[PDB]
Amino acid sequence: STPITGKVTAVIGAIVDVHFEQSELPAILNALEIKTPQGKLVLEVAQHLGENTVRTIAMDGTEGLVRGEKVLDTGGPISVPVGRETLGRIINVIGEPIDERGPIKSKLRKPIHADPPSFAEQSTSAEILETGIKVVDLLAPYARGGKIGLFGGAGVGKTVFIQELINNIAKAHGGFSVFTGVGERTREGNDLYREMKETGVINLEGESKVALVFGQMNEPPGARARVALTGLTIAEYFRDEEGQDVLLFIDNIFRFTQAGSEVSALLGRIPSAVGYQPTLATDMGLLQERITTTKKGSVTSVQAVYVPADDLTDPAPATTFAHLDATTVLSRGISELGIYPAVDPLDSKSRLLDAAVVGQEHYDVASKVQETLQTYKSLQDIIAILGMDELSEQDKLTVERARKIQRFLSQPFAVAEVFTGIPGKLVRLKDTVASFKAVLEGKYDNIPEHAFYMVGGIEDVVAKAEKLAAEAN
């Protein structure tokens, strides 16, 4: 109706400046379009420089641009399509499908810079998100609508772990998954998408249970400092429209921090500490406080954290750790022992590992498990040095118990069914509590250690015990 035509005046890398005609100025954080021969180019108003002239940052490559071209304003911020159409589509930060499965025929489109929910809308007690995985639901329980710091490099089945999480949420709570690769390696994004087709969480014809947003590495920092907000808004829709518990998976928060620092650098702002942006706490808080538990539902966010050059006083992990309620560590040593998942029991900790949170029984069970494994790990020196000779009946009992738990932490995966053939088990919480409690009491010390490797629960403990007794007979 009213084309707000702007003119390009300055192109400096990813920085674009537009002079508008009078009284036509869009507000900050609005999408701006330029019809390129290669598609459209998107801009994002970030600094009103006065003189009817504003400063935006790019969302794609800025080659071949003539200053003075017509700039189309969208008025609002970046609208991204939301809804059932978005499941199983590969979406850019712009909102366009790039899986080449045609256009997304979503009904609604939502602006990405929505406000966080109010203090009155905060659910005043974090319950435990029942995942389905034994070790997670046992040791570092996840808040329904909480923050999860996943550590660990690739090659440990981290993608296998997170696909198993997707299926366990789909079976357990029925909420959906939104994955967001900020700065994801495009080859590895392709291998991820191909696997997610093959493991069935993406069904190209049926119901894919997940929506993908891949801000690739070759995109300017203006893209990569907004890919997270795109995936955020998509998850916020499925929370606040469908009333669900929706899981937002983000990799990487540290590449997002790099993107925000580079955006603040290209805008000529003075850099702060470590070379990070000066708006670092605010740039974090605009991402974190839009992830919460409403009364409508919750968005629980799991996000990988790269520790930069192995330092924890680095302000980007020191900022991220001011929001993570639960940690999960995929060590190599656990995967070294052929254990699926590769969860370190000792390091993966929660702020909700408390008797007034999980009940007194679950707390005491996890307490005895951590104490037993801590004593076991302390003994692991003289186990290899001196042997079981130095173990008393106090000790070799606990050593045997911790071996039984260490096999018993292993769980079959519904995603490693084309890999191992053993079907995974959506292991419930109340089964898991009683199973580990009966192991902590010693009611299955007669059962061999091997009858615990990659099992579902205590019923599967009894079943595998009887099966291995029959196979030994």
Partner: protein, 505 residues
């Protein structure tokens, strides 16, 4: 119902202001980027005056120039658009003060976020009030019974004694002041106002879920009837987080200047320094050490100087402050804490390893100290804890000495055993404050070696057992400690008999 429409329509009647709406302030906005805005005009504006933009967002005009004025925002710049109309309030930045603030949860400006309607304010007060001079002060002489064991034992707090709580991430810092507020339920249920002590908690830059659970918990233990929560969460703008503790300090001054006694808790000043350097770098001002502007010492200085004990000429008001500093890996030589240590009247260091050993509270006694707390300790506690800090430093001397496995004499092994008993003694669960009458006999048992024959694991049940023992039986002695706060020799010997009775089990 329609009574909200009634109240809102009376406010529509006020919306009378349009009949006298000749503002001598309105001016166009030149530019507005990177959390700042240059506005032309406003030629009768005041320095550090509150203004309000056309999009409803308020702002503080911080730097005045011939030609324009630079006004900081109090929100996102997404709402403010260039070329708009900027009305001034006519006021230096003030906040609502009054008794109706109790129970409510507000922003940095007293606008309530609890959704409980308006604020019954008894007035408006400036943010950057001068701290009182040296003459309307008094040295502290009244205790602040925190309810914690080692806190009230070793680092007593005067009404107005500015005591730092320093620690690291997830190290039980917030729970300390939380349980202190929960201890104040004893006298806030009471009637004497000089015994009463009012609580203001200032959560800045944190998670809204965390603040919601904290407010929920304070409603569960019913601390809310004397509580005031100031929320400056991490989603909000950096100037809000900059500004909010000054506003809560003005609230504490409102209580203090009414003669009353009040407690403010800052959590945390660390993120306020982050917000302030975020401001100053967006002010294009040069940083100094660790990229902070050099006035950041003056910032927390001029904040915390507005907290002391008034003299009787002023009505004997007091305002006690509990700042919280998150450090990085147990460092006490970063630029931000070393400033705060140069300001506060003492330290409460929380070692990460002690809480890693589950010892909650994780108090490092060797670092934690108060300067003038001994002048306002409870007199009975001052009687019974004189050898206590000495014996704990003594046990700390043989703590690192005994790691070599070498056997020792009965003196040092005696100190080893009794210090182990005292170390495992001073653990305390969250939401479990202890009255002074409750804290006295545990100290009296710990000094006189009675715990030495008791198992080290048995101490935790022994504590509650001996407490329920005395509450069942020597309840008169508990009332004596409550009434006197001071143990006579007869109370001492009766206490000795009452201890050694249950020490026989």
């Amino acid at each position: 119902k329609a009574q909200p429409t009634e109240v809102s329509s009376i406010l529509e009647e006020r919306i009378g202001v349009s009949d006298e709406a000749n503002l001598n302030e309105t001016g166009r906005v030149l530019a507005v980027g990177d959390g700042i805005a240059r506005v032309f005009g406003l030629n009768n504006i005041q320095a550090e005056e509150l203004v309000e933009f056309s999009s409803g967002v308020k702002g503080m005009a911080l730097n005045l120039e011939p030609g324009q004025v630079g006004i900081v925002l109090f929100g996102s710049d997404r709402l403010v658009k260039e070329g708009e109309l900027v009305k001034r309030t006519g006021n230096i930045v003030d906040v609502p003060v009054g008794p109706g603030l109790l129970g409510r949860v507000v922003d940095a400006l007293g606008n309530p976020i609890d959704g409980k309607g308006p604020i019954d304010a008894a007035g408006r007060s400036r943010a950057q009030v001068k701290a009182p001079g040296i003459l309307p002060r008094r040295s502290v002489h009244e205790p602040v019974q925190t309810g914690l064991k080692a806190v009230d034992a070793l680092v007593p707090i005067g009404r107005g004694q500015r005591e730092l709580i320093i620690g690291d991430r997830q190290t039980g810092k917030t729970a300390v002041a939380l349980d202190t507020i929960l201890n104040q339920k004893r006298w806030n249920n009471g009637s004497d106002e000089s015994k009463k002590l009012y609580c203001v908690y200032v959560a800045v830059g944190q998670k809204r879920s965390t603040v919601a659970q904290l407010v929920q918990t304070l409603e569960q233990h019913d601390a809310m009837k004397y509580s005031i929560i100031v929320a400056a969460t991490a989603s909000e703008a950096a100037p809000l987080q900059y500004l909010a503790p000054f506003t809560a300090a003005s609230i504490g001054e409102w209580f203090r200047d009414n003669g009353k006694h009040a407690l403010i808790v800052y959590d945390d000043l660390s993120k306020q320094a982050v917000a302030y350097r975020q401001l100053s770098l967006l002010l294009r001002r040069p940083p100094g050490r660790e990229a902070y502007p050099g006035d950041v010492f003056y910032l927390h200085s001029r904040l915390l100087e507005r907290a002391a004990k008034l003299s009787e000429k002023e009505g004997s008001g007091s305002l006690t402050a509990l700042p919280v500093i998150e450090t990085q890996g147990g460092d006490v030589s970063a630029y931000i804490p070393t400033n705060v240590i140069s300001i506060t009247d003492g330290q409460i260091f929380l070692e990460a390893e002690l809480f890693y050993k589950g010892i909650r509270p994780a108090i490092n006694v060797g670092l934690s100290v108060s300067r003038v707390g001994s002048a306002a300790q409870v007199k009975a506690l001052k009687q019974v804890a004189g050898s206590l800090k000495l014996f704990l430093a003594q046990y700390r001397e043989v703590a690192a000495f005994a790691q070599f496995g070498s056997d020792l004499d009965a003196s040092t092994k005696q100190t080893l055993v009794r210090g182990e008993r005292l170390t495992q003694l001073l653990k305390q669960n969250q939401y479990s404050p202890l009255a002074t009458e409750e804290q006295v006999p545990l100290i009296y048992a710990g000094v006189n070696g009675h715990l030495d024959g008791i198992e080290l694991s048995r101490i935790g049940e022994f504590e509650s057992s001996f407490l329920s023992y005395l509450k069942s039986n020597h309840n008169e002695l508990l009332t004596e400690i409550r009434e006197k706060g001071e143990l006579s020799k007869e109370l001492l010997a009766s206490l000795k008999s009452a201890t050694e009775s249950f020490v026989a089990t």
